[PDB]
Amino acid sequence: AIRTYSTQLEEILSRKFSDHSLLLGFNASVQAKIYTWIVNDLDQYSKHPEMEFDAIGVFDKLWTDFHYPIIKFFQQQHAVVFEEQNRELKKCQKEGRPGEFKVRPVEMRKINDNFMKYIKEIYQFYGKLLKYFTTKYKNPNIPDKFLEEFRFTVSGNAIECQDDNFLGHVIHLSHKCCLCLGDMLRNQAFIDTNYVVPCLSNKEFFKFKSSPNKRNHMGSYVKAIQYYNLCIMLIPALSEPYNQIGVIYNSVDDKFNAIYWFLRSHFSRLSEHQLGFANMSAILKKHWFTTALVDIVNGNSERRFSNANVMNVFLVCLLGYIYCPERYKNGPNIVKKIPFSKIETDLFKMISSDFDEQVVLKHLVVMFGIVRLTREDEQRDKLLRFAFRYVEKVLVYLKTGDGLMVLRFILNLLRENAPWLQVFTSRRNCVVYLTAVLKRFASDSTTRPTRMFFFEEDVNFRDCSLIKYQFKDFNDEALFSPYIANMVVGDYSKCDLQDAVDEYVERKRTDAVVVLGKKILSG
RNA sequence: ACACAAGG
RNA sequence: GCUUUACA
Numbered sequence: 001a002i003r004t005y006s007t008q009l010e011e012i013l014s015r016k017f018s019d020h021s022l023l024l025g026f027n028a029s030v031q032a033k034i035y036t037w038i039v040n041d042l043d044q045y046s047k048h049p050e051m052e053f054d055a056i057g058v059f060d061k062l063w064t065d066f067h068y069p070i071i072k073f074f075q076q077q078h079a080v081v082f083e084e085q086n087r088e089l090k091k092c093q094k095e096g097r098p099g100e101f102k103v104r105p106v107e108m109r110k111i112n113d114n115f116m117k118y119i120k121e122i123y124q125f126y127g128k129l130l131k132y133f134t135t136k137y138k139n140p141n142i143p144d145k146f147l148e149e150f151r152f153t154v155s156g157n158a159i160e161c162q163d164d165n166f167l168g169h170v171i172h173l174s175h176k177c178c179l180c181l182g183d184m185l186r187n188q189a190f191i192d193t194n195y196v197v198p199c200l201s202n203k204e205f206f207k208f209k210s211s212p213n214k215r216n217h218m219g220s221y222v223k224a225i226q227y228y229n230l231c232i233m234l235i236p237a238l239s240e241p242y243n244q245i246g247v248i249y250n251s252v253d254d255k256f257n258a259i260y261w262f263l264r265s266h267f268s269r270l271s272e273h274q275l276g277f278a279n280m281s282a283i284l285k286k287h288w289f290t291t292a293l294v295d296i297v298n299g300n301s302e303r304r305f306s307n308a309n310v311m312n313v314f315l316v317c318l319l320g321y322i323y324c325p326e327r328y329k330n331g332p333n334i335v336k337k338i339p340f341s342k343i344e345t346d347l348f349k350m351i352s353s354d355f356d357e358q359v360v361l362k363h364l365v366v367m368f369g370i371v372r373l374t375r376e377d378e379q380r381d382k383l384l385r386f387a388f389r390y391v392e393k394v395l396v397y398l399k400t401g402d403g404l405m406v407l408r409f410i411l412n413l414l415r416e417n418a419p420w421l422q423v424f425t426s427r428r429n430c431v432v433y434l435t436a437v438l439k440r441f442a443s444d445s446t447t448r449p450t451r452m453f454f455f456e457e458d459v460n461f462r463d464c465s466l467i468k469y470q471f472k473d474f475n476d477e478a479l480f481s482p483y484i485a486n487m488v489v490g491d492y493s494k495c496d497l498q499d500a501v502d503e504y505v506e507r508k509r510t511d512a513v514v515v516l517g518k519k520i521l522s523g
Numbered sequence: 524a525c526a527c528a529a530g531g
Numbered sequence: 532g533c534u535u536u537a538c539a
Binding site: 329339 | 528529530531
């Protein structure tokens with residue numbers, strides 16, 4: 001069925017002259033047919049053997065062979081007209097009449113208007129499917145925050161307590177819906193920023209040529225990221241949403257956040273392990289970080305990175321010096337006579353002067369991710385020694401600063417990775433600083449504390465293999481029940497804590513860090 | 524100058 | 532051990 005429609009679609013898109021109405025009507029008919037098919041397939045799930053259940057595979061085929069190829073077709077049409085504008089510019093320039101060059105904003109807009117109609121149709125289609133999946137069946141594994149995000153309300157519908165597997169298929173289908181919405185909006189925003197906006201005026205055109213994108217325009221992707229975040233909320237184990245978030249950051253030249261998300265994609269529990277590493281490496285093999293490093297050290301620059309961005313560039317350059325020496329190692333210097341030790345010193349000062357818990361958390365994820373990916377024992381050991389020097393600087397700061405979330409992460413990283421814990425305890429200094437940090441915290445907790453809900457860091461690192469998919473410093477047994485998920489997404493809106501949430505969280509985090517630190521130090 | 528990490 | 536760079 002899907003193949004037949006795909007073949008008809010390919011015949012339509014290969015026509016030299018696009019009949020937009022034919023394409024839209026064809027899509028609408030295919031959508032209507034797939035909708036009725038999906039609902040019957042879910043309803044008949046009990047009747048036809050559970051391996052015969054195709055809806056997941058048809059959904060992936062619907063996206064890959066039908067909806068996305070139409071997106072790419074429209075994207076190509078935008079590219080053709082954009083290159084026509086380029087051909088005019090080169091012609092006028094060669095002919096000695098560069099001031100006569102005029103953008104032609106007509107016949108860009110008509111093509112984009114047809115694209116926008118298509119996007120609106122499929123946006124409604126996938127939203128309609130998502131509403132069906134999320135409200136037709138009672139699924140206690142769908143967090144309330146997700147329903148609130150869409151303002152779905154489950155009526156007294158069918159209750160498939162009979163089969164957890166059915167509910168798993170339904171939740172996967174909802175994930176795919178959110179993924180398609182994110183992907184469609186991402187492609188739309190990409191087309192708009194790179195083809196449509198540049199073709200609106202000469203006033204639009206030239207800046208794109210001079211500034212490659214200088215894409216501080218992240219707002220245009222906000223909605224796509226939102227949908228991708230919803231995907232991670234539903235099934236954080238799946239690698240694809242993290243990869244697409246990284247793709248967004250990569251497109252806006254935020255190469256560090258791209259790397260972070262590609263590593264998150266690689267380390268998700270059910271990761272395919274293809275996309276994230278390849279994209280991250282494609283960044284690392286390039287010259288962006290080395291060029292940013294030279295611009296930072298030379299001071300005078302339009303580049304003009306913020307302090308946290310400076311730390312990110314320093315971190316990646318220092319890691320590359322060990323992990324990717326062909327690009328980042330020239331004797332004792334990273335590039336252009338810039339010593340490795342100088343940049344390491346500068347970063348370690350910034351940890352004390354510009355300590356940001358989220359910045360440090362991303363630093364830790366990137367750094368220990370690269371450690372995890374390094375096979376060569378010499379490279380891995382050098383990287384680990386660098387990472388633990390960084391951790392030592394953090395612990396020194398934490399002799400006077402706050403940072404309990406970072407400390408929880410560091411301690412669970414050590415707890416869950418026995419080789420790294422062994423290296424940590426083999427370093428005298430690490431032990432001394434950890435002892436001094438913990439001596440500040442009073443705690444009558446001797447056993448792992450219980451808590452009422454997941455804290456921010458717990459939600460953020462769900463199914464991240466770096467900590468073996470969950471924080472284990474808490475006794476969370478009472479939270480891990482099928483018939484509630486609001487506590488696992490950290491939704492405390494139902495908890496009678498008012499303004500006392502922050503002190504409660506701080507106290508509970510302190511208790512957990514005291515217990516786990518003692519356990520680490522005792523060994 | 525002595526005590527710390529990088530490099531051959 | 533020495534030699535070079537960086538920090539303290």
